[PDB]
Design an enzyme around this catalytic site. Structure first.
Site, short mmCIF file in Angstrom:
data_model
loop_
_atom_site.label_atom_id
_atom_site.label_comp_id
_atom_site.label_asym_id
_atom_site.label_seq_id
_atom_site.Cartn_x
_atom_site.Cartn_y
_atom_site.Cartn_z
N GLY A 253 47.72 36.96 37.05
CA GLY A 253 46.69 36.54 36.12
C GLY A 253 46.10 37.64 35.28
N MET B 293 45.25 41.75 42.11
CA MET B 293 44.56 40.52 41.76
C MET B 293 43.06 40.76 41.77
SD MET B 293 45.90 38.58 45.18
CE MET B 293 45.00 37.10 44.74
N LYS B 294 42.38 40.27 40.73
CA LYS B 294 40.94 40.45 40.56
C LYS B 294 40.27 39.08 40.58
CE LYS B 294 37.40 42.05 37.35
NZ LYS B 294 36.82 40.70 37.16
N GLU C 299 37.42 41.76 45.32
CA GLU C 299 36.70 40.57 45.75
C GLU C 299 35.23 40.91 45.95
OE1 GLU C 299 37.55 37.73 45.26
OE2 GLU C 299 39.66 38.24 44.94
N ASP D 190 54.32 29.93 36.93
CA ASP D 190 53.29 29.33 37.76
C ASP D 190 53.08 30.20 38.99
OD1 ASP D 190 51.45 27.74 39.02
OD2 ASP D 190 52.70 25.94 39.09
N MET D 191 51.82 30.54 39.26
CA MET D 191 51.50 31.39 40.41
C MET D 191 51.89 30.73 41.72
SD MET D 191 47.62 31.80 39.02
CE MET D 191 47.23 32.40 40.66
N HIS E 6 38.73 33.52 44.90
CA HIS E 6 37.54 32.69 44.95
C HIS E 6 37.60 31.51 43.98
CE1 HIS E 6 36.14 34.35 41.14
NE2 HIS E 6 36.25 35.57 41.63
N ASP E 7 38.63 31.44 43.14
CA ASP E 7 38.78 30.35 42.19
C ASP E 7 39.54 29.16 42.75
OD1 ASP E 7 37.46 30.49 39.75
OD2 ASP E 7 38.86 31.97 38.92
N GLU F 224 33.04 31.15 47.48
CA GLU F 224 33.06 32.52 47.96
C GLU F 224 33.24 32.55 49.47
OE1 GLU F 224 30.12 35.31 46.66
OE2 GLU F 224 31.47 35.74 44.99
N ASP G 147 51.59 35.63 34.10
CA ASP G 147 50.59 34.66 33.66
C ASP G 147 51.26 33.32 33.41
OD1 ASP G 147 48.06 33.73 33.08
OD2 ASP G 147 47.57 35.42 31.77
#
Lengths: 355, 355
Positions: free
Chosen positions: B202, B258-259, B291, B245-246, B263-264, B321, B225
């Site tokens: 992403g 990954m940032k 995170e 697709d991830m 949490h999404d 979270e 992405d």
């Protein structure tokens, strides 16, 4: 500056999302969550499962993650000292934490009389009032009033064209008036003891004079208001309701009561109202005004004033808050000898203007 | 108990009007008032008249009483330590005070990189996002997600149907990512040194990998992405752009960056993503996840985590979270040996998951 580089960033982050806390708290008022916790005796600790089970659940099957949503909300509320949180020495996540009311939160639960600041929140965050904030940038650059730039008509005429808002605006004002008035009547202010005839300006239904004659039955009381309001007046012995316009004439009396009406007008109409009172009063004179005093310089002790001052300019910009010097100047412009600050009650100042 | 009673009442009054400060900060940021104060050198102390005399007015002349409104706003802002206020040594009312920037307020003025938290504040209080907060009571009482109860479609598809919100969200995300990336790349974390090929999940336009190869030219970078997003990517040698697709497959590499992706998504999708990433890595590898860790108890030292958790809850409630234990459980569910917490950078934790 090693400590600043992170503490300042943390404070900035906490400030960026500042709107989240008042949005959740309002929900916790509307969901009647603070009431359920306080409906189990003093020193109460209720887990999120019990709160989610005693909720007025119209739908029998609330989604199973509703106790998780309530727990996540109550954690945020407890992080800001509004609630106290404790662990369980025991299982689901809902069995881990217990929550209880802080004395700060007990002002939103209805008190013995049945009044709380809760409805004062809903008035502030209602859609009609909230849509005025987005025009502040335009108002600053181009002048005018934020409310008029959105709804066209002045805020004094809008409640006559909106049924829903006319209920919130009447409930919040009544609750906020009663909360302060109960402590004012219980206070040590003895100014009412020498008053023979008292006239209340803008008294509405007469609750203020109702309490005044409740503790002092010898005081003959007339409630002065507009003709548009007097048709809702509740008959009550001793009380007499007089309809008219404040700016034309005021009924004669030995004293005038007025609560938060000087900050709803400009610096010119206030002089006219004060001169009308000057004409109405006899040789002996006394004005008992309950007001709020802006400190001359910003300080951490006055936040509760400034937060509300900015509320007034974006709802009716004709009115504003004033400091002691401005009140003194207005009083001496009206011809009164001077003013005196008697006592501080519920963060409000009682001021005696003497003829 | 008078000392407790008065303090509690004052705090309750301050809490009732809690939205006024975040509504005024947004207007003071949009008006470019914090910029004008800091566009006169350090230790500025500019009076409201000068600030009102340099605004980019949309008309020939602003309202004569604009300096009064600006003074009333800046007084409220200075009451909360956002600005420093000092009386002038003696005239109009606006001449009385001088205002200057606090280190807290310098995060909203565009710094040397041209990035600040202003766009994040604008994104948080936009109409589209703010209309979700009024359905929180319905969401709690009946389940579902507040955003879907208002707009019907999932929040991941709305930006494709509203040009303005699509720009606002992108700008806010770019600013927030750039601030953290610049602060992290200057830190002492040296995990990127041993990576031969690094794949960012992403990565968007590739700013992250851009900086990574900027400081470490020997690293080979792959920007993974979705196919719909990759089309806007700027060509830059060293960054292999891969669309896909991830949840299906991940390009092979010695380390996966990954940032805030975890949490999404819900717990099942996070486990699926971790298991999919497990296949791409060789016999040894690293997962570098940026995170944020929820403390196990609602201590007063972590407000900024709970506020943003509640913000994330009422926008894409499918995500949430997590605490350290939940991250560890997910990691061992994916088959990884364990995790380590390396350093705290700008209130965010860097976590290395090792195979």
């Amino acid at each position: 500056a090693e400590e600043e580089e992170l503490c300042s960033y943390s404070n900035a982050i906490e400030l960026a999302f500042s709107v989240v806390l008042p949005m959740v708290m309002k929900a916790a008022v509307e969901l009647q969550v603070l009431d359920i916790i306080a409906k189990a005796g003093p020193r109460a600790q209720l887990s999120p499962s019990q709160i989610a089970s005693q909720l007025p659940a119209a739908a029998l099957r609330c989604s199973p993650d509703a106790p998780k949503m309530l727990d996540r909300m109550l954690c945020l509320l407890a992080s800001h000292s509004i609630l106290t949180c404790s662990a369980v020495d025991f299982a689901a996540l809902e069995d881990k934490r217990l929550y209880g009311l802080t004395p700060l939160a007990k002002y939103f639960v209805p008190n013995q009389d049945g009044v709380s600041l809760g409805p004062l929140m809903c008035l502030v965050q209602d859609k009609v009032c909230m849509k005025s904030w987005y025009e502040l940038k335009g108002a600053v650059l181009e002048g005018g009033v934020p409310f008029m730039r959105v709804y066209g008509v002045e805020s004094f005429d809008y409640p006559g064209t909106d049924p829903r808002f006319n209920e919130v605006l009447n409930n919040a004002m009544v609750n906020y008036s009663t909360i302060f008035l109960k402590k004012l009547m219980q206070s040590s202010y003895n100014g009412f003891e020498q008053v023979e005839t008292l006239v209340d300006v803008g008294g509405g239904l007469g609750v203020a004079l109702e309490l005044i004659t409740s503790k002092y039955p010898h005081i003959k009381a007339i409630n002065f208001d507009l003709p548009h309001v007097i048709k809702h007046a509740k008959p009550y012995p001793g009380l007499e309701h007089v309809g008219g316009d404040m700016f034309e004439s005021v009924p004669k009396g030995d004293a005038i009561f007025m609560k938060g009406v000087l900050h709803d007008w400009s610096d010119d109409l206030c002089l006219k109202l004060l001169k009308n009172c000057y004409k109405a009063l006899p040789d002996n004179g006394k004005i008992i005004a309950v007001e709020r005093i802006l400190p001359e310089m910003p300080n951490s002790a006055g936040k509760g004033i400034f937060l509300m001052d900015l509320q007034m300019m974006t709802h009716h910009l004709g009115g504003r808050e004033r400091t002691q010097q401005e009140y003194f100047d207005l009083a001496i412009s009206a011809g009164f000898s001077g003013i005196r600050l008697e006592c501080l009650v519920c963060n409000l100042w009682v001021i005696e203007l003497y003829k």
